Structures are given as structure tokens and as C-alpha cells.
Amino acid sequence: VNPTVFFDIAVDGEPLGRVSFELFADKVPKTAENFRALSTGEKGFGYKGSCFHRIIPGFMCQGGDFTRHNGTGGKSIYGEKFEDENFILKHTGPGILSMANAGPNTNGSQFFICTAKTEWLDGKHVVFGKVKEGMNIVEAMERFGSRNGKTSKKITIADCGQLE
Structure with a gap:
């Protein structure tokens, strides 16, 4: 009922695992459709293949x-x-x-x-x-x-898309 999307994470190519996120389209619909469309890639561009460029541990x-x-x-x-x-x-x-x-x-x-x-x-x-x-x-x-x-390693979104 709220969309769910997933990212499959890879560290220098080695698969790490899957994160899924529930998006509160009920409370922030413009913002949540924007993240949903970039995760599926349906408008032509999006998150697949991109990296986590800034990771500050504990934050x-x-x-x-x-x-x-x-x-x-x-x-x-x-x-x-x-x-x-x-x-x-x-x-x-x-x-x-x-x-x-x-x-x-x-x-x-x-x-x-x-x-x-x-x-x-x-x-x-x-x-x-x-x-x-x-x-x-x-x-x-x-x-x-x-x-x-x-980052010590390249953390990339190897695949991503919707689940619910």
C-alpha cells in the first residue's frame, strides 16, 4: 500500500545484500514518487549503477x-x-x-x-x-x-526496482 523499493548493494563488485525501503507516499508524495521513479528507472535515468559516495560511520x-x-x-x-x-x-x-x-x-x-x-x-x-x-x-x-x-571500497547499487 505504501510502495516498497529495493537496492541490491555490491562492494567493488562483490554482492553484499539487499535493502528494501518503504516510501511514505501518503505523507510526502512528490518526494516519494521522485525516489520511486529513480529506483525503477522508468523515466530513462535513475539510480542503477550508482555509488554511495559519502559514508560517515555512526551517522x-x-x-x-x-x-x-x-x-x-x-x-x-x-x-x-x-x-x-x-x-x-x-x-x-x-x-x-x-x-x-x-x-x-x-x-x-x-x-x-x-x-x-x-x-x-x-x-x-x-x-x-x-x-x-x-x-x-x-x-x-x-x-x-x-x-x-x-569510502574504502566502491559501494554501488548493482540493481534496484520496486517490490510493493
């Missing part, structure tokens, strides 16, 4: 930059950027899926998964989903990042 895993692969690109299904839809949902704990951005109303395609409650980001980043299964795979990816976010 969050960030990816979604499918154009420049380092945090300087990405785009939404609506344009380069779109507005912050609302701030109903908050960063209550691990598994929260929230949009990364560069300031007010600059959402594109980059997202991050919280591995901690990060209440200081409330009202600054739009929360739109959470880990349904595979939290242990997010924990395992977290072991490859560092204090400044550089």
Missing part, C-alpha cells in the same frame, strides 16, 4: 549522485531541483531515509540513510521513507566509510 550513508558520482550532481524527475515538500516527519532513529540537499528547496536525487537518530537535521532535510528490511546490510556498508566520508 549516515549517502548516495544518489548518478551524474557526477561524488556528491556534486544528480537530478530529480522534476528538474535539476525541487522544493522541500514538507517537514512532517523527523529523524527519529536508524533506518530513516531523508533527502540530502544544498540549502532551502534544492532537492535533486541524493538521499542518505540514517544509522543514528539525527534530530539536528529536523526541519532542514525532508524525511520520506525508512528501511523495511536489510538494516544489517546498511550497517555493513557503514563499515567502509570514514570521518570525512571517503
